Amino acid sequence: MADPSLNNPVVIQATRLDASILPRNVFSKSYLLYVIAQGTDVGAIAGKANEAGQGAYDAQVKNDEQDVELADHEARIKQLRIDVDDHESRITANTKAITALNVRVTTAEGEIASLQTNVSALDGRVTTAENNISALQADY
């Protein structure tokens, strides 16, 4: 998790050099300019170090929130896997059930046709029988 110490800037405990206080007769000129320039530059690098700290810190907070989002996505994916596999099972079951039901209805129609033929035949024979009855009754 993001490290808050990166949010603490360094405050410069030194005071911006006054060019009155440097030793007069002991230093060369070039070295004087060197000390002053080094002071200013120390200030600047301090600033850069602080800003860098803040950049890395923000990178870390972003990484943390993205870690939460990644875990969430992972979980969602896993739930979705359970659901999809269950769905696979139930789909297969439904397809097989449809096919089996189809062979059953096929057999049913097969029986229906024969029943139709039989009922027609019985109808004809019954008609002939009725005619014979009427004929036998016609005489006495």
Least separation in angstroms between residue 132's CB and a second copy is 5
Of 40 and 66, which has the nearer Cβ to Ca ion? 66
Q: 110: which 2 tokens?
A: 């097969």
Rounding to the nearest 10 degrees, give the CA dihedral for residues 66, 67, 70, 76: -120
Least separation in angstroms between residue 38's CB and a second copy is 5
Of 63 and 102, which has the nearer Cβ to Ca ion? 63
- If one asks whether residue 7 binds Ca ion (CB under 5 A), the answer comes out as no
Evaluate whether 60 touches 3 at the Cβ level (below 8 Å).
Answer: yes
| CA separation for the pair 2, 21 (Å, rounded) | 44
Which range binds Ca ion by CB under 5 A, 35-43, 61-69, 85-93, 111-119? Answer: 61-69
| CA separation for the pair 18, 89 (Å, rounded) | 83
Which range binds Ca ion by CB under 5 A, 10-18, 27-35, 55-63, 86-94? Answer: 55-63
Q: Is the dihedral of CA 104, 108, 113, 118 positive or negative?
A: positive
Least separation in angstroms between residue 65's CB and a second copy is 9
With a CB cutoff of 8 Å and minimum separation 6, the contacts of 49 are: 10
For residue 81, the partner it binds in a second copy, Ca ion, none, with Cβ less than 5 to 8 A by kind, is a second copy
Least separation in angstroms between residue 75's CB and a second copy is 10
- If one asks whether residue 71 binds Ca ion (CB under 5 A), the answer comes out as no
For residue 117, the partner it binds in Ca ion, a second copy, none, with Cβ less than 5 to 8 A by kind, is none
Within 13 A of 32's CA, how many CA atoms are on the CB side?
A: 12
Q: Which residues of the shown chain bind Ca ion in the complex (CB under 5 A)?
A: 63, 66
